[PDB]
């Protein structure tokens, strides 16, 4: 039971420039013998946690100059003087000192800094092939956009529907440094068929103008 | 009556269970004793008994080890 | 140093599994070692941990009284015996080495997954807009399927395309995902486009073909 | 006075030198002391101390161990 | 300095006839702890010394039943039931109960029993190879005897002579369990010249009559 | 389970040497393991012990303060270090493993020479009767060499003979041999005998001939 909180949950930087992670604990983690407990681990995408720093400020084995490790008591601070790409993953911070339970921080995610895009918004109506045995998912694509936070709404006849809206985005893009998010909205084959107007609408803020894709069923 | 170890005043009880060092201080502080004071030990006859169990520093008596189970000695004046 | 895990693998509610972490490149009986799982949401949790000689063991309050960490020094193996499996001790398990008073080596890791649904296929439809721009983006919509693990393949007419790969939501015990494909305005309808989608668990392979 | 283990009289003097069967029990012989009485310290709470040591029945207080070296004490009434 | 003491030196059996070595020590081997370290080990010929018996009638692994140990205190004996071909070669007692040091019996050999057998005996007169260089060598084998027992003089002009005589045995002839041995006299040329009559004589159970083999240095 | 020693050799008196006995098969650090010298008159003579850890050492009277016994566990290897070697130290070296309260597995050993004599040819005499019976006994004298091994080999006109190879007897720090040869008396003067004589040490083959 002790709390590691780590802030930010995303940190963007772009190559070369410093990046700095906090972590925070419940409890003081300095030790009765001196030594203060808190380590940092890195976990690259597809591989398994590594170690970075240990006890505050000890880099581990083969791991650069650029990394370090600072704090006391409560809090700590992982700096990178200048990120490469090499660096990119997910830092968690840990403490050993009041165990067991051995507790993680949250994570915080290095990821790229890139220029702003707007969404590439495109809207399906659900195909006959679902329609005919029942079931309407109204798809919305919104691809190759940055930063991160968008909003999307679904519209149906103009009011927003909350029912049955599910949203999955993709991971930083490898090509291009951009993000993509799938948006469904299930509604039944009737349900569907009772209205006319779809709208998947959203909001970025590299336009103070929403990005409106709709279909009329009786187009 | 020292069922243990007895240093001037003291009474050192051999706790033969592996512990955490934090679960051992405890462990003492539970039953009104504290670990043993590493400089007070070292140039005793005590220091045969109580090397390598838990000092009262957080190591035991003479890379790290904060993570490992040791014996433990509670000491408890009379 | 290496350190490898294996046993991981889909279980059902109250069932039973055993993993193993087999290691090498260090003198075994020397190190304490612990368990540590990684949740969907991307999370480290400590599970288990075991001193050098396996006389005493930790465990995190979770798995108090259903997991069991022992091991053999003789065959340099750590073991994570777990009953009465929950939905909530679904991860990757990996077991880590510790070293400094932090974990300095771990394995790759293994994956557990606790659930009762039943191995179900795909059903697959095709995404095409409704009846503009120079590219065109296709999809196709990937529906209520059990386990994880699709694969979706697309044929277009141009070598230039980007493929968007969404991952799975658990949707009414049954995995939903969705791909789209991002092709020029010339080369769809006027070529065909279609979605091949595997899904090896049910030994299935749907094709969609993208029709205006 | 006794700097070691008291009980019921007797004197235990840990001797941390690991020594093979022989050796150890001529050692507490010259000292005027005998090794430890399996029987008689091994419901008490001495037990936890003299474990894994050599007995006056030529055995480690608890295969084939008459070669090999422990720990002992030397006992000797007061 | 706990002597063993074994007897026999060398034991002749026959193949399938019982056998039993003596092994004594100088104080009581039995410990303290109620066991009695006594042990026996055998040594096959080009072969290290392997285990058979350890803590008095102890059969090791892979030892058989008819291979067994007893006494007590100071007097112990091992028995061999029947005697097979693979037993032969030598046994050695030990003591482990008043160490350091750990001490070793002198070794029984066990050998093949088989019919009496007068030597083949020749005798060399020294090679002229040898004679102008200045070296005398008189040889004489005497091969194939049984049993080992024998008795050899050398005789110049008559008379016995026990200066600069060489004997050297052989082990147990593998063919037909015999013993043959080589003896040597040298003397230097001018002494060997100033003598007529070379004789090498041996006296064996087999015969009340010395084998007598001579050569005249003017024949 | 496996022991084997290297190392042995010759050397000078006053001189050093390291044997070696890397073993197999068991747990190394486990066990506590003696060296035991099998000396020229064929009798076994204690010389070392060592504890599991090496914390512990014993020597004979007779090595005190001249060989040090010492290991290295994580290379499962016993060592047996020689300083001031004296020809009494002329023995095959075991080591052996401590089990039961004796000692239960033995290597193979390794040969020890002490000795200031230098590398020497053999001289080779044969021996021929002076100036009868259905056989012959031949012989050659194989006189003042240094080291041991040499290997007599003979040829005859007869498939049947025997041969019989006499244990070398050290005489003014040199050894002395003899061979002998017994063959069917219609097959010598008639045929030629031969032995030939190689000295490895020193590269050396010497033929004689036998004549009457
Ligand atoms: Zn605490
Ligand atoms: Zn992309
Ligand atoms: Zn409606
Ligand atoms: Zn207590
Ligand atoms: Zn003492
Ligand atoms: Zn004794
Ligand atoms: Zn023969
Ligand atoms: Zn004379």
């Known amino acids: 039971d002790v709390v590691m909180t780590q802030t930010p949950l995303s940190l963007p930087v772009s190559l070369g420039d410093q990046a700095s992670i906090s972590c925070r604990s419940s409890q ?26 240990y006890k505050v400020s000890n880099r581990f084995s083969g791991v650069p100059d650029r990394f370090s490790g600072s704090g006391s008591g409560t809090d700590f601070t992982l700096k990178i003087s200048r ?11 840990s403490q050993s000192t009041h165990i067991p339970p051995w507790t993680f921080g949250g994570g915080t995610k290095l990821e790229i800094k890139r220029a702003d895009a707007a969404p590439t918004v495109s809207i399906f109506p659900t195909i006959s092939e679902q329609l005919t045995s029942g079931g309407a998912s109204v798809v919305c694509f919104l691809n190759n956009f940055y930063p991160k936070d968008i909003n999307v709404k679904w519209k149906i006849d103009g009011s927003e529907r909350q029912n049955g809206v599910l949203n999955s985005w993709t991971d930083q893009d490898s090509k291009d440094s951009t993000y993509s998010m799938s948006s469904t909205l299930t509604l039944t084959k009737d349900e569907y068929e009772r209205h006319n107007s779809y709208t998947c609408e959203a909001t970025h803020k590299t336009s103070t103008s929403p990005i409106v894709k709709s279909f009329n069923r009786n187009e | ?29 539970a039953e009104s004793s504290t670990l043993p004071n590493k400089s007070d030990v070292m140039i005793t006859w005590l220091i045969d008994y109580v090397e390598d169990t838990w000092g009262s520093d957080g190591n035991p008596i003479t890379s790290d080890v904060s993570q490992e189970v040791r014996k433990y000695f509670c000491v408890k004046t009379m | 140093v290496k350190l490898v895990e294996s046993g991981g693998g889909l279980v059902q509610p109250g069932g039973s599994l055993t993993l193993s972490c087999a290691t090498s490149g260090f003198t075994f009986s020397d190190y304490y070692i612990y368990w540590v799982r990684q949740t969907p949401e991307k999370r480290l949790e400590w599970v288990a941990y075991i001193s050098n000689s396996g006389g005493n063991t930790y465990y995190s309050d979770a798995v108090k009284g259903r997991f069991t960490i022992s091991r053999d020094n003789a065959k340099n193996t750590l073991f994570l015996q777990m009953s009465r499996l929950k939905s909530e001790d679904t991860a990757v398990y990996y077991c880590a080495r510790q070293w400094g008073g932090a974990m300095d080596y771990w394995g790759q890791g293994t994956s557990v997954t606790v659930s009762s649904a039943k191995t179900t296929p795909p059903s697959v439809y095709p995404l095409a807009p409704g009846c503009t721009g120079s590219s065109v983006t296709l999809g196709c919509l990937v529906k209520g399927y059990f386990p994880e693990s699709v694969t979706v393949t697309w044929n277009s007419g141009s070598l230039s395309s980007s493929v968007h790969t969404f991952p799975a939501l658990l949707q009414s015990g049954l995995y939903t995902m969705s791909s789209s494909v991002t092709v020029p305005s010339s080369t769809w309808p006027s070529q065909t486009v279609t979605c091949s989608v595997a899904h090896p668990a049910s030994s299935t392979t749907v094709d969609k073909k993208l029709e205006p």
């Open chain 2, 1 to 29: 009556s020292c069922n243990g170890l007895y240093y001037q005043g003291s009474c050192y009880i051999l706790h033969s269970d592996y512990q955490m060092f934090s679960d051992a201080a405890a462990n003492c502080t």
């Open chain 1, 83 to 93: 990120v490469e790409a090499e660096d990119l993953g997910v830092y968690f911070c």
């Open chain 1, 28 to 53: 003081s983690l300095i030790h009765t013998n001196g030594n203060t407990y808190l380590h940092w681990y890195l976990q690259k995408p597809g591989q398994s946690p590594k170690l970075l720093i």
